[PDB]
Amino acid sequence: PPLRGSGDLGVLIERADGSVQILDGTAKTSLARVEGLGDLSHASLVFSRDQRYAYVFGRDGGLTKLDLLAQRIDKRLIQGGNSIGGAISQDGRLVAVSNYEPGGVKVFDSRTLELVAEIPATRLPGQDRNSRVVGLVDAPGQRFVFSLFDSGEIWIADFSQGDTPHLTRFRDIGKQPYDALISPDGRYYMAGLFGEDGMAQLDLWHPERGVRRVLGDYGRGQRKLPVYKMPHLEGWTIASDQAFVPAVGHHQVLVLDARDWKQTDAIDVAGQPVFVMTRPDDRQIWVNFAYPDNDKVQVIDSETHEVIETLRPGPGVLHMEFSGRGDQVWISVRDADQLQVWDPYRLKRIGSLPARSPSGIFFSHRAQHIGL
Amino acid sequence: PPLRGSGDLGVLIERADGSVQILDGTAKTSLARVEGLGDLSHASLVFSRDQRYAYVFGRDGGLTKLDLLAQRIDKRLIQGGNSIGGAISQDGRLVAVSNYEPGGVKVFDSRTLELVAEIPATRLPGQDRNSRVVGLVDAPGQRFVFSLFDSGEIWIADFSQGDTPHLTRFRDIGKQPYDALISPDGRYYMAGLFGEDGMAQLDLWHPERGVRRVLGDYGRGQRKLPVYKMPHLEGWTIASDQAFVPAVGHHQVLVLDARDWKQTDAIDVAGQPVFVMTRPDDRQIWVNFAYPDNDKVQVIDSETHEVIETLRPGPGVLHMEFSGRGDQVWISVRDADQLQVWDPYRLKRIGSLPARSPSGIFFSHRAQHIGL
Numbered sequence: 001p002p003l004r005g006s007g008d009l010g011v012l013i014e015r016a017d018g019s020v021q022i023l024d025g026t027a028k029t030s031l032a033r034v035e036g037l038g039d040l041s042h043a044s045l046v047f048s049r050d051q052r053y054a055y056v057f058g059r060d061g062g063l064t065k066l067d068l069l070a071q072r073i074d075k076r077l078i079q080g081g082n083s084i085g086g087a088i089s090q091d092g093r094l095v096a097v098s099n100y101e102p103g104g105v106k107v108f109d110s111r112t113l114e115l116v117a118e119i120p121a122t123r124l125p126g127q128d129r130n131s132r133v134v135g136l137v138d139a140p141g142q143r144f145v146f147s148l149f150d151s152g153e154i155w156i157a158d159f160s161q162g163d164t165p166h167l168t169r170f171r172d173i174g175k176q177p178y179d180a181l182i183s184p185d186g187r188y189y190m191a192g193l194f195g196e197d198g199m200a201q202l203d204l205w206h207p208e209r210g211v212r213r214v215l216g217d218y219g220r221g222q223r224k225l226p227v228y229k230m231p232h233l234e235g236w237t238i239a240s241d242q243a244f245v246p247a248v249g250h251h252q253v254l255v256l257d258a259r260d261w262k263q264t265d266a267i268d269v270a271g272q273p274v275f276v277m278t279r280p281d282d283r284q285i286w287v288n289f290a291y292p293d294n295d296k297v298q299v300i301d302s303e304t305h306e307v308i309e310t311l312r313p314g315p316g317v318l319h320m321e322f323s324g325r326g327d328q329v330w331i332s333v334r335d336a337d338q339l340q341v342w343d344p345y346r347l348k349r350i351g352s353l354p355a356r357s358p359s360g361i362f363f364s365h366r367a368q369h370i371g372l
Numbered sequence: 373p374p375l376r377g378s379g380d381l382g383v384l385i386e387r388a389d390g391s392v393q394i395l396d397g398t399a400k401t402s403l404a405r406v407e408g409l410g411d412l413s414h415a416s417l418v419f420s421r422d423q424r425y426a427y428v429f430g431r432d433g434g435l436t437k438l439d440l441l442a443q444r445i446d447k448r449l450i451q452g453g454n455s456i457g458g459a460i461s462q463d464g465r466l467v468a469v470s471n472y473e474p475g476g477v478k479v480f481d482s483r484t485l486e487l488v489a490e491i492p493a494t495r496l497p498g499q500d501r502n503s504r505v506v507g508l509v510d511a512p513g514q515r516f517v518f519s520l521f522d523s524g525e526i527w528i529a530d531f532s533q534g535d536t537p538h539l540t541r542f543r544d545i546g547k548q549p550y551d552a553l554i555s556p557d558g559r560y561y562m563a564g565l566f567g568e569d570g571m572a573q574l575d576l577w578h579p580e581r582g583v584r585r586v587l588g589d590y591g592r593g594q595r596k597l598p599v600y601k602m603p604h605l606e607g608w609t610i611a612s613d614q615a616f617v618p619a620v621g622h623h624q625v626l627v628l629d630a631r632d633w634k635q636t637d638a639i640d641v642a643g644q645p646v647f648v649m650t651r652p653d654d655r656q657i658w659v660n661f662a663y664p665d666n667d668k669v670q671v672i673d674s675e676t677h678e679v680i681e682t683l684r685p686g687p688g689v690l691h692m693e694f695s696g697r698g699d700q701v702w703i704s705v706r707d708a709d710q711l712q713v714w715d716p717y718r719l720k721r722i723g724s725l726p727a728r729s730p731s732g733i734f735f736s737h738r739a740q741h742i743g744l
Binding site: 003052053282 | 377424654741
């Protein structure tokens with residue numbers, strides 16, 4: 001294909017067909033469809049540091065190195081037991097993937113996909129399997145950080161001195177950490193708890209201070225919510241002073257003091273929030289919802305905490321993604337087989353591309369940001 | 373040339389020869405030298421939103437659209453009176469350049485370099501001239517914001533409706549604003565004053581609130597310092613709570629409370645600071661100095677405010693540039709004819725490339741960030 005820049009390239013997951021579309025974000029057009037990625041019914045991805053490749057992590061444990069410029073699969077491996085949790089290191093050389101069977105982290109060379117390190121999680125007493133690993137992120141200092149669901153731990157894997165990592169293990173951090181995030185500046189790791197309420201916070205500048213329990217009320221309490229009905233911590237937005245997060249099993253966006261981790265306001269919204277996102281200029285909060293309210297997207301003023309507008313793009317709004325500078329927001333409408341493009345200042349639709357059951361949408365500016 | 377990503381591509385200014393080198397940031401190599409850019413003895417640049425092109429603003433008023441992938445000049449014009457102050461719009465379509473003759477802002481189609489809007493500054497009495505324009509930035513909302521040195525004004529040019537902007541003019545903001553910055557979140561515009569002390573701050577979210585004077589004692593005071601010896605506001609670094617900035621004519625880096633805009637600390641450093649930069653993870657502050665101390669770079673712990681180390685890359689250290697995720701820092705050593713790449717976590721040089729009087733070094737991840 002002809003020469004083109006990689007800075008405005010997007011990847012759209014087609015969740016029922018094991019395929020992706022590669023998108024020209026500036027022209028608002030589809031460049032290609034690539035097939036052969038297996039089970040993408042759930043999927044995530046990261047980009048190489050030059051933006052030429054996406055690493056797609058599929059529900060089948062597939063790891064696909066996708067060449068966005070040659071518009072083809074470059075390399076692919078399938079490892080049963082690997083999850084969609086995948087991350088890329090600060091220097092772009094290592095791609096880590098969590099696994100839930102037997103439980104641990106595997107780290108691959110970003111060029112060849114050859115195995116560089118296998119990190120088994122704690123072996124469960126009286127068993128021949130390990131703790132599931134969840135909440136894998138990359139962090140500054142050529143580190144990966146992740147949580148152990150069954151045994152209640154957080155570990156740091158430090159690759160700064162070589163391919164055999166230095167491991168730091170924090171035990172008894174909380175019952176069943178099920179997901180985690182790293183703050184946008186790369187300093188704080190926060191794991192949400194499923195076996196009790198609260199979140200476990202680690203200051204990655206000062207890991208010697210240990211893990212700190214914060215936001216002690218945030219969780220399912222005594223409700224029997226399954227794991228997958230808990231908030232996805234990717235659906236948290238953390239600003240400088242404020243965080244906007246989905247309520248656990250309620251139709252509210254909670255506003256948190258991001259310093260003391262206390263709720264300061266609550267916003268009634270048109271459904272159970274699934275993802276809470278920020279326009280890149282921090283002035284608007286964008287929210288999508290769980291079925292039966294997943295035909296709507298609400299836009300909230302970050303200052304007044306009032307709903308500005310309720311958009312209705314169509315049935316099955318799974319994911320959204322802003323352009324790097326925020327001139328666009330892209331919205332997957334699964335049950336309308338459309339990937340829409342909107343102007344988030346006018347709140348008007350400026351494009352709508354056909355797609356097969358579209359889900360995750362990712363643009364290549366993620367390549368330059370820790371945690372993405 | 374062959375297919376390659378754009379995400380790790382950089383541009384190095386060779387300031388005496390009117391040329392640049394295009395750099396592969398991952399391989400740490402030079403891909404090409406491109407000549408024919410006129411007078412780059414002063415120069416700045418921004419990138420297209422697909423990271424394929426750089427727009428180089430030359431001291432001769434040259435505007436060069438440089439193809440990083442084809443490794444050639446794609447388009448070039450020379451606009452009499454244009455300054456090196458240039459910026460690119462939130463949607464990537466418009467490139468604006470400040471102008472001292474006749475005085476105003478010129479706006480160009482980023483694809484063709486067609487002149488699409490001319491904004492004259494306020495007229496000056498008794499001359500066939502307008503105020504010269506300084507401190508031009510892009511801002512969210514498809515805006516450009518700039519200051520008028522001679523008439524003491526700040527203007528917002530809103531291009532959201534097309535090529536004819538809507539202008540909001542703030543008068544009597546302070547005597548002789550000489551430079552400006554926009555905060556990393558894109559919310560606040562701050563112009564430094566030369567005719568008196570202090571900074572003029574405009575809240576771009578609430579322009580109806582006008583311009584407020586902040587940091588009222590920061591300036592040259594009663595000292596007869598010429599405008600060209602005032603700090604360049606590009607050399608300010610603003611974090612969430614703290615700013616680190618060059619003192620005005622003192623061998624100190626000032627720590628400012630970013631919320632109340634008041635100095636809280638002053639760090640003794642090895643010369644007159646020129647640029648104060650932050651490692652992308654906010655842990656370290658990097659400082660370069662004016663002659664005769666421009667053979668040194670100092671690294672400061674952002675928490676303790678102490679100098680960690682004094683680096684000596686060589687003579688004439690004019691500029692530094694971090695990679696997107698912070699795994700690298702690139703340092704131009706003008707009088708060694710060397711561009712060095714350093715590991716900012718080990719604080720050690722890891723490689724060098726030859727260059728002719730290297731000055732500015734810019735990597736394409738800037739394409740994704742308001743104000744860069």
